[PDB]
Design a protein around this motif. Sequence first.
Motif, short mmCIF file in Angstrom:
data_model
loop_
_atom_site.label_atom_id
_atom_site.label_comp_id
_atom_site.label_asym_id
_atom_site.label_seq_id
_atom_site.Cartn_x
_atom_site.Cartn_y
_atom_site.Cartn_z
N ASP A 1 126.40 -0.39 -46.79
CA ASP A 1 126.72 -1.85 -46.76
C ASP A 1 126.37 -2.57 -47.98
O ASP A 1 125.40 -3.08 -48.34
N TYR B 1 126.04 -6.50 -48.21
CA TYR B 1 124.71 -6.74 -47.65
C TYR B 1 123.44 -6.61 -48.54
O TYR B 1 122.55 -7.62 -48.92
N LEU B 2 123.29 -5.33 -49.31
CA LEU B 2 122.33 -5.32 -50.23
C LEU B 2 122.28 -6.21 -51.53
O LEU B 2 121.27 -6.77 -52.01
N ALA C 1 123.52 -9.35 -51.34
CA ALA C 1 122.99 -10.67 -50.70
C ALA C 1 121.60 -10.52 -50.80
O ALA C 1 120.85 -11.41 -50.97
N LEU C 2 120.99 -9.35 -50.24
CA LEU C 2 119.35 -9.35 -50.08
C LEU C 2 118.96 -9.39 -51.51
O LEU C 2 117.65 -10.02 -51.65
N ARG D 1 114.95 -3.65 -43.00
CA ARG D 1 116.06 -4.27 -43.62
C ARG D 1 117.12 -3.42 -44.61
O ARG D 1 118.03 -3.50 -44.45
N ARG E 1 118.64 -0.51 -42.74
CA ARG E 1 119.89 -0.92 -41.94
C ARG E 1 121.25 -0.91 -42.73
O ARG E 1 122.16 -0.74 -42.04
N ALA E 2 121.12 -0.99 -44.05
CA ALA E 2 122.36 -0.78 -44.96
C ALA E 2 122.98 0.45 -44.80
O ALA E 2 124.18 0.62 -45.36
N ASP F 1 123.38 1.84 -37.35
CA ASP F 1 122.68 2.17 -38.54
C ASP F 1 121.69 3.03 -38.49
O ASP F 1 121.25 3.34 -37.35
#
Length: 540
Positions: A160, A163-164, A166-167, A301, A304-305, A534
């Motif tokens: 993802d 997502y990463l 954004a993280l 977290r 989960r990607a 995930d």
Amino acid sequence: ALEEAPWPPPEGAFVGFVLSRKEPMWADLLALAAARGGRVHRAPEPYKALRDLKEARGLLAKDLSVLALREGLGLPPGDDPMLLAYLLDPSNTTPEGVARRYGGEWTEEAGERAALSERLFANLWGRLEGEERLLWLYREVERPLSAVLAHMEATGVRLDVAYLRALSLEVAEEIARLEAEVFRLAGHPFNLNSRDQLERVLFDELGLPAIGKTEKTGKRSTSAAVLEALREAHPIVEKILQYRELTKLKSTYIDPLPDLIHPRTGRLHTRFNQTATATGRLSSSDPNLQNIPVRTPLGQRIRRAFIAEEGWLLVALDYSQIELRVLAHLSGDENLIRVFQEGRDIHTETASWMFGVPREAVDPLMRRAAKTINFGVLYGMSAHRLSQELAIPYEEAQAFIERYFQSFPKVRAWIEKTLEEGRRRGYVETLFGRRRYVPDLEARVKSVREAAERMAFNMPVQGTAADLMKLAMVKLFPRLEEMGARMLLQVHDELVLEAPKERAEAVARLAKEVMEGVYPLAVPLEVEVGIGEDWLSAKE
DNA sequence: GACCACGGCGCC
DNA sequence: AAAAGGCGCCGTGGTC
Ligand SMILES: O=C(CCCCCCCCCO)NCCC/C=C/c1cn([C@H]2C[C@H](O)[C@@H](COP(=O)(O)OP(=O)(O)OP(=O)(O)O)O2)c(=O)[nH]c1=O
Ligand SMILES: [Mg+2]
Ligand SMILES: [Mg+2]
């Protein structure tokens, strides 16, 4: 030497090939050639010429197979001298060294690599005739495993990306918060990433007590274990530990991984190195996907990607207490066998004692702590270190290590047997006969010799567990192909599969049973299996 | 741009 | 750091 003949080569020829870069999924195939019967066939156009081969036979066969798979060609790897050399002596890890040792020179020309593959294979095969157990490992484990690994490498894993990314932005702001506090506490700024500059700040400027020295250069250490001892001497210590946690995860995973998505597959592709470790384990590189975070909230977290393709699910399977069960088999300790025949869990029981809590309230993070302890102690941890990590008097750690081995008498007996055997023969071996040469068992410097001993008697255990997992992979892969599922990752005693949602449950049950019954031992092998969208959710 | 050595640390 | 073992990758420091 060989007489130059026209492409294509005859059947069974050994191949040579040159890549623009080491990673087969990212490489340009610069040149291709093949050698057989005293002839050399050099491909005029290497990509077109790939289609004429039915098998990749030669040095680094898997890598060329991965490139072929990337190009839509089913070119399975076959004989590879690297696998023969690695079984003879696992210090044989590079084509450079293997060629120099067994009769040639690893050049940067495909024809010469082809002829080299041929003559190395002849010589190395000669070295193995008689070595029936190593031959069994080559035929039934390593050579078929190379085909499995090539498919894993070419398949990749979905990530993802958004997502990463954004993280990254959130973690950056949190990092700045921590480093600004560190500078305030230090009274000035400096490069917090430079352990040399941090050493001066903590030990010269702030005058904190130095606790440990570094291995090669004898500087005052700033390691997490050292900072752990100082968490209360000064508030900057904690800020630094949190700073290191975040920047480690950001610089190693969050920021690099999104840029490694392959343009034609849309996925992330690792390499599974088959001749890289002293014990028989695989490794993973470019990127390493065997060290994806899992321990801390941020690490979770990140894990989960790693997600399943839409319409699919991940299935994660993990051998339970694997090296303890292997130890029960190798050592034959009656008391340890009963532990697993009774279904007990040593990691949970140690966790219970560690935290003074009944088994039922041992959480997952507590069990991870107990695993470091149980395997630390087993492979030779000192009471000093154990007392220091558990925050208990030296005498308590002393006693724990004492009870540990007393519970299981024949272990130290097996250790001493393995060591004496290694001193005399010069190598130690796994259950299947995989060897590791440990000549430093006879070193006259005590620290060197005893480190060699801990290496020596660890290898039959770690190594047997590696042999089991490799064998399970070879048995499982065709079964998955049948059901339209995929093998994605191996993490030493864990497999991550990808299955269509409709068949995920049937895939889980089958893979569980294949892993548990790969090669029965004196104790049951148990496998924990989870399913999810995930990687994190797919573990129980 | 790249090599290494090192300390350090992510995973098993 | 420490008498745990096995990996690979990061940034630094220092080159080349
Ligand atoms: O994450 C942690 C630390 C947790 C936090 C504790 C700090 C508290 C500080 C105080 C604050 O107040 N520890 C890492 C845990 C994972 C370590 C695994 C490990 C594995 N192996 C080997 C032995 C093992 O059998 C095999 C497979 O690893 P595994 O699958 O994780 O373990 P195993 O199969 O034995 O157990 P389960 O799979 O959980 O049944 O790999 C080792 O030799 N050493 C290790 O440290
Ligand atoms: Mg396990
Ligand atoms: Mg595991």
